[PDB]
Amino acid sequence: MTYNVWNFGESNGRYSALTARGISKETCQKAGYWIAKVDGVMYQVADYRDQNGNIVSQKVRDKDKNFKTTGSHKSDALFGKHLWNGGKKIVVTEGEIDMLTVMELQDCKYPVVSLGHGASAAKKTCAANYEYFDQFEQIILMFDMDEAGRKAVEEAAQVLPAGKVRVAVLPCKDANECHLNGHDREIMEQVWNAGPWIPDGVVSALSLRERIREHLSSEESVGLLFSGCTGINDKTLGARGGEVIMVTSGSGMGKSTFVRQQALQWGTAMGKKVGLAMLEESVEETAEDLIGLHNRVRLRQSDSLKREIIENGKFDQWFDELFGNDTFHLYDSFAEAETDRLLAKLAYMRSGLGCDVIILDHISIVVSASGESDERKMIDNLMTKLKGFAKSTGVVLVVICHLKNPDKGKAHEEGRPVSITDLRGSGALRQLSDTIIALERNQQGDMPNLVLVRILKCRFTGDTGIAGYMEYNKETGWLEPSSY
Amino acid sequence: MTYNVWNFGESNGRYSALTARGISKETCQKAGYWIAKVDGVMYQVADYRDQNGNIVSQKVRDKDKNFKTTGSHKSDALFGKHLWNGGKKIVVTEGEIDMLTVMELQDCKYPVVSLGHGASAAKKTCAANYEYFDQFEQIILMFDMDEAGRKAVEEAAQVLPAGKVRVAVLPCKDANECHLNGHDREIMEQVWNAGPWIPDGVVSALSLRERIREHLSSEESVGLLFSGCTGINDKTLGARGGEVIMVTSGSGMGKSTFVRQQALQWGTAMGKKVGLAMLEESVEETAEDLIGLHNRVRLRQSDSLKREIIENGKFDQWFDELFGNDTFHLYDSFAEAETDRLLAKLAYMRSGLGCDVIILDHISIVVSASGESDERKMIDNLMTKLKGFAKSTGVVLVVICHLKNPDKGKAHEEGRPVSITDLRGSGALRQLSDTIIALERNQQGDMPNLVLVRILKCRFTGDTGIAGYMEYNKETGWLEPSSYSG
Amino acid sequence: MTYNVWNFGESNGRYSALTARGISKETCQKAGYWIAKVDGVMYQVADYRDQNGNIVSQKVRDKDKNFKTTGSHKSDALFGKHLWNGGKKIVVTEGEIDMLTVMELQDCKYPVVSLGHGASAAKKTCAANYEYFDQFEQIILMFDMDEAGRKAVEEAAQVLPAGKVRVAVLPCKDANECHLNGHDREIMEQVWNAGPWIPDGVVSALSLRERIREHLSSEESVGLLFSGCTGINDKTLGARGGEVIMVTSGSGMGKSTFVRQQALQWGTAMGKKVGLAMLEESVEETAEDLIGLHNRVRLRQSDSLKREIIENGKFDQWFDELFGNDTFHLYDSFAEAETDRLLAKLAYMRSGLGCDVIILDHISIVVSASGESDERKMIDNLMTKLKGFAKSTGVVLVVICHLKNPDKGKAHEEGRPVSITDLRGSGALRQLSDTIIALERNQQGDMPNLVLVRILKCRFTGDTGIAGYMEYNKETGWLEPSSYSG
Structure with a gap:
């Protein structure tokens, strides 16, 4: 009933660059990201290969950002998992385009993976890949920067190796949104400058300041x-x-x-x-x-x-x-x-x-x-x-x-x-x-x-x-203050 | 187990005018509302397209106004959703015919949508379309004007982007019922005005006056x-x-x-x-x-x-x-x-x-x-x-x-x-x-x-x-007032 | 309501090799695992025989790995039970495919059995077969290597012959997943080794040397x-x-x-x-x-x-x-x-x-x-x-x-x-x-x-x-130490 893995040489496939996202040709070729032209439409294909290179499933989207899954998109779907045999740190994004962002800045040299079923199955996807994610000393959860995204972060870290979870601060929507704006400097920080900061949901930023500023100044x-x-x-x-x-x-x-x-x-x-x-x-x-x-x-x-x-x-x-x-x-x-x-x-x-x-x-x-x-x-x-x-x-x-x-x-x-x-x-x-x-x-x-x-x-x-003390004025019905 | 999506060319489809409803051919063509024949079998089809024009489901009715659904009539069913990608205000009717009324007066140029599953699933349909409806600064609830209609209005405002909810108060049963009568003048005014709330009944009395003047003058x-x-x-x-x-x-x-x-x-x-x-x-x-x-x-x-x-x-x-x-x-x-x-x-x-x-x-x-x-x-x-x-x-x-x-x-x-x-x-x-x-x-x-x-x-x-005090008169069975001070 | 036991020669029966699982023909013949055809399907049958060779029940799956049981699949269902009358060590896998892996490298010569009802009934099946499993000096539990698999392993010490239970740790999903990859070498090692077993092992301490040293030293x-x-x-x-x-x-x-x-x-x-x-x-x-x-x-x-x-x-x-x-x-x-x-x-x-x-x-x-x-x-x-x-x-x-x-x-x-x-x-x-x-x-x-x-x-x-004692400084809001004695 599920769709079938689109063959690269069987649907006008080519490894072109995502200019509208900030990703060059070289990066897409290594991660397994190609463009298919079926029925004239322009589909985006993410190859989910196994431990031996054999494509198991694919995540296909088009111009209108509609989703279409092929093959056996099991619960342990990790885009880029076949590229890294362990190491020191691993970046776990939410979307494949964001997974293409971190690799671009790291020149496709350092472990980066994406979630198979978006932000919803983040808990299930990470739990299914606990054995895999435990091959790294650190796990960089770089999900989206919004209500649903922060919920995905919370539900992932719970069924992940406790003590190796890591979240990236993004002053934009996602990793790609930062890249296309200026801030490659805040993405790189997790491997290049930052390192700490991961628990959200508790709203603790310490440098909140502004809500405290707002309270004292605007309350009566x-x-x-x-x-x-x-x-x-x-x-x-x-x-x-x-x-x-x-x-x-x-x-x-x-x-x-x-x-x-x-x-x-x-x-x-x-x-x-x-x-x-x-x-x-x-x-x-x-x-x-x-x-x-x-x-x-x-x-x-x-x-x-x-x-x-x-x-x-x-x-x-x-x-x-x-x-x-x-x-x-x-x-x-x-x-x-x-x-x-x-x-x-x-x-x-x-x-x-x-x-x-x-x-x-x-x-x-x-x-x-x-x-x-x-x-x-x-x-x-x-x-x-x-x-x-x-x-x-x-x-x-x-x-x-x-x-x-x-x-x-x-x-x-x-x-x-x-x-x-x-x-x-x-x-x-x-x-x-x-x-x-x-x-x-x-x-x-x-x-x-x-x-x-x-x-x-x-x-x-x-x-x-x-x-x-007070006294009820039977005339006015008021509570006028009394002596004593 | 659902029916297959009806084909316009394979069902002798033509974009005719709803003479007995007040809707011309031009309106039917833009919303995706056509008439199918094939062996004299006269059904009216409402095309529920997605964000790319592709027909997803259809709501089909005949002479006896019997209903028949084809395709995937999902929870977020919105007739006309494919026509608007955001805007200032959007009109939300109950039936597709009412959705065809508002568009008729507006020359099919301003955001008007219909409910997929009538007034019953109003709560579910609107909740399923919260992301979509929030692309508008106002949401015009122009539901039917009856007992059931006011319940749908009530159950809508709860799961709708608060502050932008708005209800149209019509003199007749519905928008089309107004149109076929005289009152196109009450629909159009109520398109960009009204501004309800739809509260419990706060005040909503400018600020308190309206019921109080009415009460205190006529009170007990x-x-x-x-x-x-x-x-x-x-x-x-x-x-x-x-x-x-x-x-x-x-x-x-x-x-x-x-x-x-x-x-x-x-x-x-x-x-x-x-x-x-x-x-x-x-x-x-x-x-x-x-x-x-x-x-x-x-x-x-x-x-x-x-x-x-x-x-x-x-x-x-x-x-x-x-x-x-x-x-x-x-x-x-x-x-x-x-x-x-x-x-x-x-x-x-x-x-x-x-x-x-x-x-x-x-x-x-x-x-x-x-x-x-x-x-x-x-x-x-x-x-x-x-x-x-x-x-x-x-x-x-x-x-x-x-x-x-x-x-x-x-x-x-x-x-x-x-x-x-x-x-x-x-x-x-x-x-x-x-x-x-x-x-x-x-x-x-x-x-x-x-x-x-x-x-x-x-x-x-x-x-x-x-x-x-009082006294029980064993003769009259009354409680006559007594004289007592213990 | 239970199905009738499939006859080998009556369902085009053949003993073939699982090329996509790493199992040859010779092995299937010895374990009693055959393929039935009819109507363009090839079903895989696991013969659960008793002590006399007589087939009692069967576990049948197809291409989509859907399950269908025939005969009397009792709680003590053990695939391969009829092959061994006691021995030194016995391997108890989870599925029949894992049960088909271990002995093949071993030429089907030493005890290997499977669970009748997967990982869920691991507790009941082993309890129902306490008399049988105690005819061995060791019991090699090589279940799956996942969340659910380790849970089946966990409830072993609770309902298994205490002291003869053995846990397998594999570099993949299950035994067959290792076989088709490289690691036939980690399976065989864990068939005659491992040992521990299994729950909270706070014993025999000693190995807590460095961490306790670490705790008191880096957390005074x-x-x-x-x-x-x-x-x-x-x-x-x-x-x-x-x-x-x-x-x-x-x-x-x-x-x-x-x-x-x-x-x-x-x-x-x-x-x-x-x-x-x-x-x-x-x-x-x-x-x-x-x-x-x-x-x-x-x-x-x-x-x-x-x-x-x-x-x-x-x-x-x-x-x-x-x-x-x-x-x-x-x-x-x-x-x-x-x-x-x-x-x-x-x-x-x-x-x-x-x-x-x-x-x-x-x-x-x-x-x-x-x-x-x-x-x-x-x-x-x-x-x-x-x-x-x-x-x-x-x-x-x-x-x-x-x-x-x-x-x-x-x-x-x-x-x-x-x-x-x-x-x-x-x-x-x-x-x-x-x-x-x-x-x-x-x-x-x-x-x-x-x-x-x-x-x-x-x-x-x-x-x-x-x-x-202390005194609340209404100025600083602190609890400054006081000098008091009641």
Whole structure:
């Protein structure tokens, strides 16, 4: 079923030079690279010979870079393998043209081989040739310089003689792309000047510099400062781009109210693009809170004030004053937000809308992979991905979780300082969350509107404890900072 | 096992014009769309060429619009892919005929492509062609304009180069349906404009205004009116179009009775359309109570009264008085009622019959996907889907649940205040539901008919605590407001 | 359903020579390997006879080397078994073609047999023929010379007559591949020699002379010598290569700062190549810490200092001063790290980059083969593989773990000495890891910057207890040694 080895003297074969790639006639003749003119078209043939010269398979491509295989292209296909009986170092490229590049610079004097089945079977091809590649003291993996190419490098070195793998740095696409540009000086370095450097994928370049330069210069440093109460700023220095602020308290003690002030203030006074994910209220209601909160009023609790602003078009007045800066974007559905049907949407703001802060209310709403007993694992899987997206893009991620009901004394609603153990979900939230804000208030005591703010964690500063106090203004619905 | 590639010259092929579709000969010639005869066998062939012109596969249809595929119809099947090698914008239709419409208006000069396997493989076909589609700064999804079409649009944008995705909103069924009608003017505008997104529905309201102005002007407007006892209204202001009321009490203490009064009250005085889902009682028993409740009588608790109103023709009198306004609607099943065998129908009321309030009595009859340990997830999974449904439609959803038996002292029916922890503790119903109504009564005390109403939750106001009291009138079966202060 | 045994004279049978395999006619006649024709095909038949000559089963292949079995191919299928009634040595190849090679050079005079079912059933076939194979003083296993072939060789010592097994090493693929090339000389040598056999041969030592001499001499225990406080060095003498240093405290009081100083110190004063895996902070933030820590400042906690070194060009100055020697290398992804293949990346280092020291911050980054209840086994499984790689390559592996929150008194951040039981995970890390460093401090007392260092385990010295004290300089961010005695 497979095609058959094209005979050199039976398909207009000639050993011509690859001017469009930078390879002369002399090199192609030694590696087994010829040009066939069948049906008038111009095919490129790579002779995969065995240990005795007998051609086993061939890799044929044309002008449109289409691939056609002849003979027995087994898993151990290595272009040029028949030329070298061992030595000191061997260069292992990805394509035959790149294999023709190294030999050109080395005058076809030093061991160079290519991969049979491209970058995909790199792992299989190298594993099938472990016995062969172990005949050399070093193995120069010179694959392409891109996403798929770097994946091929990783999958090759694993099933290769550990301690002899070597990768070439290329400021271009591949070996031939360097040659046709200037940089024969960086190709030659592996045999001629360099030698070290091989492990990628870990992104370690040490001389990264630029991403560090970019971070300090372009991030807002202290991107914002928590409003409604200082002292939180004294112990946290606001929130940065990449961290995850953790806000929690008792049921109906101001988790939403506190965070909603931050969303409002940041998107108004310090014009940040704030993203909202209120999985427990309609975007009209969340805006309703924002609208009332902005105008220092309780628009929600008042049916009269709702009725007031309607019978005169006062919506447009306050609205244009607030959302007119196009700073607020939210999530609308209610209909079950799956995990990677939420992370996808949360990413859409950050990236598409260009938001600087993302707000996720209530993180006990999982709705994903139902069948795995105990959602204590679901939250852990979710928390890591939420932490990941936030930092890898540099957004500010503020999330609200709830608290385990202790049933061990007077609980939350009647005092009780909340610690790290009372946190809902498994002990991943005690680790991923860079900063943890906690609110405590006695709504059955003399000071129900008095709320205590406690920092439970801050990777940034490490300064924990009680920040300050605040008071819920039943008129404005704001959290004005208190004395004490 | 596939068919051989049809030959243009060997199948009497000619490049004719699609008169009944609005496409001229010139358009057919450039896209590779021809007509084959041979013994009167009239098929239309779509040539799916590769990057060199060589025909790879064909999609062949006839008079009856039956489909027949030849060659290698691979995943990356794109009709017209061989015509464009990059560009500014590219139009992506669904069928080849729609792909022939866009090219017709553009003089077959601008990038237009079709889907190989219709709207079903839209996700697979577009993902297979990510490398190709990224050679354009914009990707115009001009799919069909229907239920299935909007699903294909949705499943396309996910596996397409983000930021460059765009959808065409047509007044008709498809691009060709617009063309043959008048509206070539809506296709052409939508070729280089539109600019969707296709989000979930972020905002997408310029920036927030469009739905909010619409909502706040017409908002609740479904804020209802809890009757039977004021004070519940004083601390909750009732329920909203989107909220979910959680009503509970000790087993058989007035859970069914209380909610049944509101459904009656709402569906009579303030003409609201109430939907009923009584899974523990047949629709006939619920009507019996409602009829008796409306006329202030224990219609059940009397073999004489049942016999009475029937023989003198007083049944039809009360019946027309109550259900006459065509407001009350119910569900018949009893057969376990699977989760997505209720939610589908619960939506049918809200949507088809147009109800403002839906009542779901007893939420321990889950019965769905039996084989997973602990129904502790079923109640949670159901509550989330129930809560979601409420807001996306804007319906007031009142649901009744049941409590665990404490056995840590005197239990519920003899006193004992029901807090938020004693129900299910790690309950999801304490999270999804916005307002939680609780009834408490000592049926073994001096006042068994006396019932205490306690607000356990209110996302709206946040004002919790004891609302008021009520008295069970053994004559009318109503919950009349009482005078009490312990 | 099994095929009927092919008759020689009924399928045009002939005993011919395998010109393309290097086997003459004379040999095929003696082994019972013949060619059947019919319908333009020549099939190759391997007669598996019993002790009486009667053919029991056959293994038939053609040109494309496709396999077809006839008769009763039992587990003890041994091609050539009928030829030998005991002897000195016996050669057991993998395929029949290899079985056809060895005796031919030997004129078919000494025992050679093949496996009935290739390399896969090597374990079962040899076990089924233990009685037969033990009739010889030696058993020459000349299987293939590849990945799969050596695996069949490996499971020999497990299910073969202990002491008589023999392994063949060939310069090619198999025995026939050597024959057609040159090397008939390496086959015959290995039929009467080799010897060992086979698995982990740590014996009889002696041959470990130069490498142990080399290890202690050129690795005086890798690196060692901590910094920050003498006393840690007094009780541990440092951190050997192949050891796993365990650092822990009350999550959110330090640990990272201490470990970060060691990475800095080792990668600066005692120039070691330190690899970093900060799975909780991107490399730019960790470098920010390292840069500031190197320059005796808290560059993270000063909006003023960050802008300072940028505008007057002091950033590049410190940067080149630190990383200019290519001593520091890091990991970055932060997008749910896994095990397969991440441990591969950790293992891939050490060799390529030459990393003398690897630092793993945080060891609760699970999220891998999820679906296995309780991550208590994952931490154990990971610790073994981490301990394995570290020692098998000889790189210092420093890992930071957290503590279970006790809720049995005042917890961690208010005092409380941490024991070996307080360690997170089902204490496998208390077994695999060698040295265990613990930090204790009260951030709610009079001396919050005062931190006590406690050794919980040290395989190298066995000296446990309290090492010394330190004080966190809020200015430099360092752990300077303190002078304290409680």
